[PDB]
Amino acid sequence: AFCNLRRCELSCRSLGLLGKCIGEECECVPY
């Protein structure tokens, strides 16, 4: 299902990192 990138940036911000939509599922990434 089409992934929200804007939400995943601010959700991964809690960990300290950026969220990417990979295969339309979110991943907080080390970059």
Side-chain angles (χ1 to χ4, degrees):
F2 287 110
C3 175
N4 195 318
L5 182 61
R6 295 174 289 192
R7 192 196 305 146
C8 288
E9 288 191 29
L10 66 75
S11 182
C12 297
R13 189 180 68 203
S14 193
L15 316 182
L17 38 156
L18 283 167
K20 281 66 173 69
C21 286
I22 307 301
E24 305 304 307
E25 298 291 335
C26 285
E27 163 70 322
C28 314
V29 101
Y31 310 144

Coordinates of all heavy atoms in Angstrom, one line a residue:
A1 N 0.8 -1.2 0.0 CA 0.0 0.0 0.0 C 0.9 1.2 0.0 O 1.9 1.3 0.7 CB -0.9 0.0 1.2
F2 N 0.5 2.3 -0.8 CA 1.4 3.5 -0.9 C 1.8 4.1 0.4 O 1.0 4.5 1.2 CB 0.7 4.5 -1.8 CG 0.6 4.2 -3.3 CD1 -0.6 3.8 -3.9 CD2 1.8 4.2 -4.0 CE1 -0.6 3.5 -5.3 CE2 1.8 3.9 -5.4 CZ 0.6 3.6 -6.0
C3 N 3.1 4.2 0.7 CA 3.8 4.5 1.9 C 3.9 6.0 2.2 O 4.3 6.8 1.2 CB 5.1 3.8 1.9 SG 6.3 4.1 3.2
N4 N 3.6 6.5 3.4 CA 3.8 7.9 3.8 C 5.3 8.1 4.3 O 5.7 7.7 5.4 CB 2.8 8.2 4.9 CG 2.8 9.7 5.2 OD1 3.7 10.4 5.3 ND2 1.6 10.2 5.4
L5 N 6.1 8.7 3.5 CA 7.5 9.1 3.8 C 7.6 10.2 4.8 O 8.4 10.2 5.7 CB 8.2 9.5 2.4 CG 9.6 9.8 2.5 CD1 10.5 8.7 3.0 CD2 10.2 10.2 1.1
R6 N 6.7 11.2 4.7 CA 6.7 12.4 5.6 C 6.5 12.1 7.0 O 7.2 12.6 7.9 CB 5.6 13.4 5.1 CG 5.9 14.0 3.7 CD 4.7 14.8 3.2 NE 3.5 14.0 2.9 CZ 2.4 14.4 2.2 NH1 2.2 15.6 1.8 NH2 1.5 13.5 1.9
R7 N 5.6 11.1 7.3 CA 5.4 10.5 8.6 C 6.6 9.7 9.1 O 7.0 9.8 10.3 CB 4.1 9.7 8.6 CG 3.6 9.3 9.9 CD 2.6 8.1 9.8 NE 1.5 8.4 8.9 CZ 0.8 7.5 8.1 NH1 1.2 6.3 8.1 NH2 -0.1 7.9 7.4
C8 N 7.2 8.9 8.2 CA 8.3 8.1 8.6 C 9.6 8.9 8.9 O 10.3 8.4 9.8 CB 8.5 7.0 7.5 SG 7.1 5.8 7.7
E9 N 9.8 10.0 8.3 CA 10.9 10.9 8.7 C 10.8 11.3 10.2 O 11.7 11.1 11.0 CB 11.0 12.2 7.8 CG 11.6 12.0 6.4 CD 11.9 13.3 5.7 OE1 12.2 14.3 6.4 OE2 11.8 13.4 4.5
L10 N 9.6 11.8 10.6 CA 9.3 12.3 12.0 C 9.1 11.1 13.0 O 9.4 11.3 14.2 CB 8.2 13.3 12.0 CG 6.8 12.9 11.6 CD1 6.0 12.1 12.7 CD2 5.9 14.2 11.4
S11 N 8.8 9.9 12.6 CA 8.8 8.7 13.4 C 10.2 8.2 13.7 O 10.5 8.0 14.9 CB 7.9 7.7 12.8 OG 7.8 6.5 13.6
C12 N 11.0 8.1 12.7 CA 12.4 7.8 12.8 C 13.3 8.8 13.5 O 14.3 8.5 14.2 CB 13.0 7.4 11.4 SG 12.2 6.0 10.6
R13 N 12.8 10.1 13.5 CA 13.4 11.2 14.3 C 13.4 10.9 15.8 O 14.4 11.3 16.5 CB 12.6 12.5 14.0 CG 13.2 13.8 14.7 CD 12.3 15.0 14.4 NE 11.1 14.9 15.1 CZ 9.9 15.6 14.8 NH1 9.8 16.4 13.8 NH2 8.9 15.4 15.5
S14 N 12.5 10.1 16.3 CA 12.5 9.6 17.7 C 13.7 8.8 18.0 O 14.3 9.0 19.1 CB 11.2 8.9 18.0 OG 11.0 8.7 19.4
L15 N 14.2 8.0 17.1 CA 15.4 7.2 17.2 C 16.7 8.1 17.0 O 17.7 7.8 17.5 CB 15.4 6.0 16.2 CG 14.1 5.2 16.1 CD1 14.3 4.1 15.0 CD2 13.7 4.6 17.4
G16 N 16.5 9.1 16.1 CA 17.6 10.1 15.7 C 17.9 10.1 14.2 O 18.7 10.9 13.8
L17 N 17.2 9.2 13.4 CA 17.6 9.0 12.0 C 16.4 9.2 11.0 O 15.3 9.6 11.5 CB 18.2 7.6 11.9 CG 17.7 6.4 12.7 CD1 18.1 5.1 12.0 CD2 18.4 6.3 14.1
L18 N 16.7 9.1 9.7 CA 15.7 9.3 8.7 C 15.0 8.0 8.3 O 15.6 6.9 8.2 CB 16.3 9.9 7.4 CG 16.5 11.4 7.6 CD1 17.4 11.9 6.5 CD2 15.2 12.2 7.5
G19 N 13.7 8.0 8.0 CA 12.8 6.9 7.5 C 12.7 7.0 6.0 O 12.4 8.0 5.4
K20 N 12.9 5.8 5.3 CA 12.7 5.6 3.9 C 11.6 4.6 3.6 O 11.4 3.6 4.3 CB 14.0 5.1 3.2 CG 15.1 6.3 3.0 CD 15.7 6.9 4.2 CE 16.8 7.9 3.9 NZ 16.3 9.1 3.2
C21 N 10.8 4.8 2.5 CA 9.8 3.9 2.0 C 10.4 2.8 1.1 O 10.6 3.1 -0.1 CB 8.7 4.6 1.3 SG 7.6 5.6 2.4
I22 N 10.8 1.7 1.6 CA 11.4 0.6 0.8 C 10.4 -0.5 0.5 O 9.9 -1.1 1.5 CB 12.7 0.0 1.5 CG1 13.7 1.1 1.8 CG2 13.4 -1.1 0.6 CD1 14.3 1.9 0.6
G23 N 10.1 -0.8 -0.7 CA 9.0 -1.7 -1.2 C 7.6 -1.3 -0.6 O 6.8 -2.1 -0.1
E24 N 7.4 0.0 -0.5 CA 6.3 0.7 0.2 C 6.1 0.3 1.7 O 4.9 0.3 2.2 CB 5.0 0.6 -0.6 CG 5.1 1.2 -2.1 CD 5.6 2.6 -2.1 OE1 5.0 3.5 -1.4 OE2 6.6 2.9 -2.7
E25 N 7.1 0.0 2.4 CA 7.1 -0.2 3.9 C 8.3 0.6 4.5 O 9.4 0.5 3.9 CB 7.2 -1.7 4.3 CG 6.0 -2.6 3.8 CD 4.6 -2.2 4.5 OE1 4.7 -1.7 5.6 OE2 3.6 -2.6 3.9
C26 N 8.1 1.2 5.6 CA 9.1 2.1 6.2 C 10.3 1.4 6.9 O 10.2 0.3 7.5 CB 8.4 3.1 7.2 SG 7.5 4.4 6.3
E27 N 11.5 2.1 6.8 CA 12.7 1.6 7.4 C 13.5 2.9 7.8 O 13.8 3.7 7.0 CB 13.5 0.8 6.3 CG 15.0 0.6 6.5 CD 15.4 -0.4 7.6 OE1 14.7 -0.4 8.7 OE2 16.3 -1.1 7.4
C28 N 13.9 2.9 9.1 CA 14.8 4.0 9.6 C 16.2 3.5 9.3 O 16.7 2.5 9.8 CB 14.6 4.2 11.1 SG 12.9 4.4 11.7
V29 N 16.9 4.3 8.6 CA 18.2 4.0 8.0 C 19.4 4.8 8.5 O 19.2 5.9 8.9 CB 18.0 4.1 6.4 CG1 18.6 5.3 5.8 CG2 18.2 2.8 5.6
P30 N 20.6 4.2 8.5 CA 21.8 4.7 9.2 C 22.5 5.9 8.5 O 23.5 6.4 9.0 CB 22.7 3.4 9.2 CG 22.3 2.7 7.9 CD 20.8 3.0 7.7
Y31 N 22.0 6.3 7.3 CA 22.6 7.3 6.4 C 22.3 8.7 6.9 O 23.3 9.4 7.5 CB 22.2 7.1 5.0 CG 22.4 5.6 4.4 CD1 21.4 5.1 3.5 CD2 23.5 4.9 4.8 CE1 21.5 3.8 3.0 CE2 23.6 3.5 4.3 CZ 22.6 3.0 3.4 OH 22.8 1.7 3.0

